[PDB]
Amino acid sequence: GAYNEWKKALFKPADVILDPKTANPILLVSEDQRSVQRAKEPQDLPDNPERFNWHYCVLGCESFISGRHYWEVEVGDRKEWHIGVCSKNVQRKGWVKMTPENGFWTMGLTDGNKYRTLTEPRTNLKLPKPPKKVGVFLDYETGDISFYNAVDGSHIHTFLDVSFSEALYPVFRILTLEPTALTICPA
């Protein structure tokens, strides 16, 4: 459909690989650096400055300061996940609420069937069909971060007209231990 035919004409396909130095110690990044899973217990890793030490998050290796970019994530039948972008200077040590005011523009799924925007306060989304693949779209200059169902092209949510000042990284968060990973679709 138009989603597949047009996405690369309008947004540059990012090749997103997960950065293991950023991943909370309870997360596992695959060898190909496209998938993340959770362990039962935190692994023994350094508490280096880049690492999220409280939130179960991991970033992409590359950030954006301009332009239009997109990537796609296979959420599959996971019951819990949140994805989007965050500022380079978010608080990585200790808790902060993941909200736009704190430098996070994310949405996702909790409890199998509760889709939300991670706004302050959180807002519930009503999705007619559960997505299996989500496209994440950034237009830095217009300030828009949009999410689409990458199979049928349907709109999930847009953060509109944000005045970004920092570099933005792709961010991914998983809280649950489940058989299916969260995986980036390769460009």
Ligand X SMILES: CC/C(=C\COP(=O)(O)OP(=O)(O)O)CO
Task: List residues near ligand X by CB under 6 A.
Answer: 55-56, 97-98, 118, 122, 173, 175
Rank residues 74 and 80 by Cβ distance to ligand X and give the closer one: 80
Min. distance of Cβ 73 from ligand X in angstroms?
17
Residue closest to ligand X (Cβ): 55
Backbone angles phi, psi at 4, to 5 degrees: -70, -35
Rank residues 15 and 120 by Cβ distance to ligand X and give the closer one: 120
Min. distance of Cβ 90 from ligand X in angstroms?
12
Query: Which helix (H) or strand (E) is 125 found in, with range?
Result: none
Residue 157's contacts (CB-CB under 8 Å, 6 or more residues apart) are 107, 117, 125, 146, 147
Rank residues 66 and 113 by Cβ distance to ligand X and give the closer one: 113
- How many residues would you count in the chain? 187
Min. distance of Cβ 86 from ligand X in angstroms?
12
Rank residues 71 and 104 by Cβ distance to ligand X and give the closer one: 104
β pairing state of 68-74 and 12-13: parallel
Q: Do 33 and 145 contact (CB within 8 A), yes or no?
A: no
Min. distance of Cβ 105 from ligand X in angstroms?
13
Q: Do 84 and 107 contact (CB within 8 A), yes or no?
A: yes
Q: Which of 13, 38, 9 is nearest to 24 (CA)?
A: 38
Tokens, residue 51: 């690492």
How far, in Å, CA of 139 to CA of 83, rounded? 16
Half-sphere exposure of 113 (CA within 13 A, CB side): 2
Min. distance of Cβ 175 from ligand X in angstroms?
5
Rank residues 45 and 175 by Cβ distance to ligand X and give the closer one: 175
Rank residues 117 and 149 by Cβ distance to ligand X and give the closer one: 117
Min. distance of Cβ 76 from ligand X in angstroms?
19
